[PDB]
Amino acid sequence: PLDEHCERLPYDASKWEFPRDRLKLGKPLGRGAFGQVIEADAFGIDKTATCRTVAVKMLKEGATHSEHRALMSELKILIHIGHHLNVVNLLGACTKPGGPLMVIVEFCKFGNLSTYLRSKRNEFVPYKDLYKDFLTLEHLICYSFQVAKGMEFLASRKCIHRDLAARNILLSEKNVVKICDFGLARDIYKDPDYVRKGDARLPLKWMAPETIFDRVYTIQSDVWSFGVLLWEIFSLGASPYPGVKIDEEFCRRLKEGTRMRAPDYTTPEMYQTMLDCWHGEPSQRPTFSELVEHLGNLLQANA
Ligand SMILES: Cc1cc(C(=O)Nc2cccc(Oc3ccc4nc(NC(=O)C5CC5)cn4n3)c2)n(C)n1
């Protein structure tokens, strides 16, 4: 993957630089130790003379030059990745001296998918006036399909995600979901999804065994995380491994082949897809291209 050597990638200011005076900063959408994402109104960022609500990642009190460098690398990799319906897309950046580095991307109205799905437990029917804004199996399979599409796209750009999870999937209008990476804008030392392992705070419940045990990150470890994301979707935003202490024993049992049981809203095919994504052998997990085909088929079969 090339997303490990981002520093060599271009930042074409003539294309991407957006004047700070055309950006009206609003309320925070999330804050971490060193970073934050702010809602903003950007004047003419993507359509002439048109105000657009955007999401702006920038640093905050606590951040150092190290985080600034990291955010610049994120900007460069976003340019490299480019645009897809199912990825949060870069719209512009403010990089000029005299103000903070700001990475400006599409704003997703409904925010993170885990929180959203958890808010819809009382507004779900597998199939359907009364149920106008209800989620259905079609929605859940559709979100799954879309994330697979976005990951297939990221893979085509020779990138890997490394923190795939429902908290990093954002819901926009018209049931479009987008892969994001909140990164420094999340407080990982305070977020229970990130567990202390050594001197790192890691998303253990989403990590493939080879990642946990061997520090190996590949597109196939993202497929494992995608299986966990599927479980999150088909549990309507439940936390993975309910009633399991996330410790050395968990990791051992996981490596041994123990897996989550089927969540409440799954279809049998979807649960089997989860199990497939959780193959112990990375090369035996489906690829995102295969998942795209498969989920497209399940989405159609639902219709
Ligand atoms: C590498 C790499 C990095 C990224 C990346 O995504 N960077 C990124 C950049 C800027 C903001 C950001 O986070 C966002 C983005 C859109 C958004 N919309 C909401 N909406 C809400 O909160 C709603 C009120 C509920 C919240 N955000 N936060 C993520 N990628 C894809 N790859």
UniProtKB/Swiss-Prot annotation:
The modification Phosphotyrosine is found at residues 131, 189, 194. Changing residue 189 to F: Strongly reduced autophosphorylation. Abolishes phosphorylation of downstream signaling proteins. Keywords: Angiogenesis, ATP-binding, Cell junction, Cell membrane, Cytoplasm, Cytoplasmic vesicle, Developmental protein, Differentiation, Disulfide bond, Endoplasmic reticulum, Endosome, Glycoprotein, Host-virus interaction, Immunoglobulin domain, Kinase, Membrane, Nucleotide-binding, Nucleus, Phosphoprotein, Receptor, Repeat, Secreted, Signal, Transferase, Transmembrane, Transmembrane helix, Tyrosine-protein kinase, Ubl conjugation. Its main location: other. GO terms for molecular function: ATP binding; cadherin binding; coreceptor activity; growth factor binding; Hsp90 protein binding; identical protein binding; integrin binding; protein tyrosine kinase activity. Disulfide bonds join 159-180. ATP binds at residues 29-37, 57. Homodimer in the presence of bound dimeric VEGFA, VEGFC or VEGFD ligands; monomeric in the absence of bound ligands. Can also form heterodimers with FLT1/VEGFR1 and KDR/VEGFR2. Interacts (tyrosine phosphorylated) with LFYN, NCK1, PLCG1. Interacts (tyrosine-phosphorylated active form preferentially) with DAB2IP (via C2 domain and active form preferentially); the interaction occurs at the late phase of VEGFA response and inhibits KDR/VEGFR2 activity. Interacts with SHBSH2D2A/TSAD, GRB2, MYOF, CBL and PDCD6. The gene is KDR. Changing residue 57 to M: Loss of enzyme activity. Residues 23-297 form the Protein kinase domain. One of its GO terms (biological process) is protein autophosphorylation. GO terms for cellular component: anchoring junction; cell junction; early endosome; endoplasmic reticulum; endosome; external side of plasma membrane; extracellular region; Golgi apparatus. Tyrosine-protein kinase that acts as a cell-surface receptor for VEGFA, VEGFC and VEGFD. Plays an essential role in the regulation of angiogenesis, vascular development, vascular permeability, and embryonic hematopoiesis. Promotes proliferation, survival, migration and differentiation of endothelial cells. Promotes reorganization of the actin cytoskeleton. Isoforms lacking a transmembrane domain, such as isoform 2 and isoform 3, may function as decoy receptors for VEGFA, VEGFC and/or VEGFD. This is Vascular endothelial growth factor receptor 2.
